[PDB]
Amino acid sequence: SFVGLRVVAKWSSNGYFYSGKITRDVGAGKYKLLFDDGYECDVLGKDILLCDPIPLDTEVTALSEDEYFSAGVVKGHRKESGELYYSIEKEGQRKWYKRMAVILSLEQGNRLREQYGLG
Numbered sequence: 001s002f003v004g005l006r007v008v009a010k011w012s013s014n015g016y017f018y019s020g021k022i023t024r025d026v027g028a029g030k031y032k033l034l035f036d037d038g039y040e041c042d043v044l045g046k047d048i049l050l051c052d053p054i055p056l057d058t059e060v061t062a063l064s065e066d067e068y069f070s071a072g073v074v075k076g077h078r079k080e081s082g083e084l085y086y087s088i089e090k091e092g093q094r095k096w097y098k099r100m101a102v103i104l105s106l107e108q109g110n111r112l113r114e115q116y117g118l119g
């Protein structure tokens, strides 16, 4: 039903939401999450957001090369070679991030639960 869909899902350890796919319904109201970095984890429906892509004007967190966390706003999407990129704005400047370098803080994800939450 929801298996195969791209989602943004909570990693319970640090409370942030990361890009992945529901691979399997595994019962207990849980889904097998394949994260885009290849990490795998069973995640509750309430911790999964079904937005693909993350919409324009969403508040997000960009991961740097150094795994620095920076807040920004989605102002663009681009398909390049079958892959999604996000234009993220901070302080009037925009930078391109691969799909998997865009995450949601606990509060940025919690804020999307009403419209996009699998629940």
Ligand SMILES: Clc1ccccc1CSC1=NCCN1
Pocket: 011, 018, 019, 020, 035, 036, 037, 039, 063, 100, 101
């Ligand atoms: Cl999609 C992504 C991109 C960058 C960092 C993490 C993830 C997945 S969550 C996780 N990875 C390893 C442990 N938890």
